[PDB]
Amino acid sequence: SFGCSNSGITDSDRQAFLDFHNNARRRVAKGLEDSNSGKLNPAKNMYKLSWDCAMEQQLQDAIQSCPSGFAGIQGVAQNTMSWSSSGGYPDPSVKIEPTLSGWWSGAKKNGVGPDNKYTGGGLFAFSNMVYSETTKLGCAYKVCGTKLAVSCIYNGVGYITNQPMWETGQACQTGADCSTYKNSGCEDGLCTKGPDVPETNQQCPSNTGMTDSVRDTFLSVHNEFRSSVARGLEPDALGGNAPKAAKMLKMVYDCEVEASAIRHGNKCVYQHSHGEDRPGLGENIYKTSVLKFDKNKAAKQASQLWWNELKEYGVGPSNVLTTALWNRPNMQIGHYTQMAWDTTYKLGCAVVFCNDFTFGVCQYGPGGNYMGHVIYTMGQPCSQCSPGATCSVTEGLCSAP
Fold first, then answer.
1. Which residues face 189 on adjacent strands?
2. Can you name a GO cellular component term (predicted)?
3. Alpha-carbon distance 324 to 303, whole Å?
């Protein structure tokens, strides 16, 4: 049906954009898509795209003059292609397939790394098409005399350095296999996103700018990484895995710590707050060029980019945060350390839409990154938890709340 008002393209065009993307996504998911050398890895959690009229209309409005470069539309990644011909374009629909196949040819021509990680080398356009967490699609073309621009925008970002375009696994069998969004369906190996759950703010009613869904994203992503690291499961670029943690505390969400992150977030200056403005609190910051970026997507991406420091740069088996590891050229580790800091247990975050970037701030109480100190005490999980605390060996986190 589509139900789009835009007369710039036809339904037949919308169906050709949409089908090309989903057929190619399903091929990847099924492990059937060619690479430069063998087959691409199969995909779990590979979502089917749905058409979005609002996304389509906005993109259509931006290309009326066949501009050079990117539209700068909010909340989305963009793919773009320009054609020239002295004969003009009496049937622009015939350029849909070679545009999309030209975007797609990224992977076959250059290849994709063993973890399906984005590294560029010419995967930009392929990454937007294939990105597993993307659920919405909007495309449009415009004729400008002898010039044709064909473009698609996507509600997910696939060009982030070292982030996996998709996770290797079997394609979904039922909707229970789709882990990215709750209550997803499954159509022949493609996950299908259901309707959006309404955003609530019951955890911290005095604060403005944050919602419960975003809080639980930060909190669960933090805790799950701390659980993983305490049990010896997290890879370290400096050798093997990071050591087991003896007394890794489970984080709780804290409204006051949130209110403090919100204050700094609302200033819209990409830098650390002064330590006296967050007294006794650690801090992690994040921005992305994408404007008005989904707050949950921004929370998950920020958390992972901070965490990735361990597998990218490394800490080593002593687990000590040293000035020698700190001062490494082009290597930062301090965002990861604060996330893994065992004495740190209150989390409060903010995601603020600034006019220049989506800004993400998390604050940490009591706050780590003591120079010359271990990031966490090393030993068997739960071994050194405080006298009255609970801990399971299958999670490895000391908790009292």
1. 172
2. extracellular region
3. 25
Task: At 68, list the tokens.
Answer: 């050079």
Domain 198-401, CATH 3.30.465.10 — does that match? no
d(CA 168, CA 46): 10
How far, in Å, are 43, 46, 134, 199, 400 from residue 179 at the CA level? 12, 10, 13, 20, 28
Is the peptide bond preceding residue 205 cis, with omega within 30 degrees of 0?
A: no
Domain range annotation of the chain = 1-197, 198-401
Resolution (angstroms) equals 2.2
**CATH fold of 1-197:** Pathogenesis-related Protein p14a (3.40.33)
Structure tokens at 317: 């088996």
Sign of CA dihedral 363, 366, 368, 374: negative
- The SS3 assignment for 99 reads helix
Compute how many other C-beta atoms are within 10 angstroms of the C-beta atom of residue 114.
7
Q: Which two tokens stand for residue 375?
A: 């990031």
Closest CA to 173 of 186, 160, 155: 186
Instruction: Report the alpha-carbon distance of residue 346 to residue 400 in Å, rounded.
Output: 13
Angle between helices 96-104 and 11-29 (to 10 degrees): 20
Rounded Cα distance between 201 and 323, Å, is 41
Strand duo 252-253 + 346-353: pairing: parallel
DSSP class of 379: S
Contact 40, 34 (CB under 8 A): yes
Q: Do residues 280 and 254 touch, judged by C-beta distance below 8 A? A: no
Task: Give the chain's length.
Answer: 401
Three-state secondary-structure class, residue 168: strand
Experimental method: X-ray
Burial of 84 per CB tally in 10 Å (0-12, 13-18, 19+): exposed
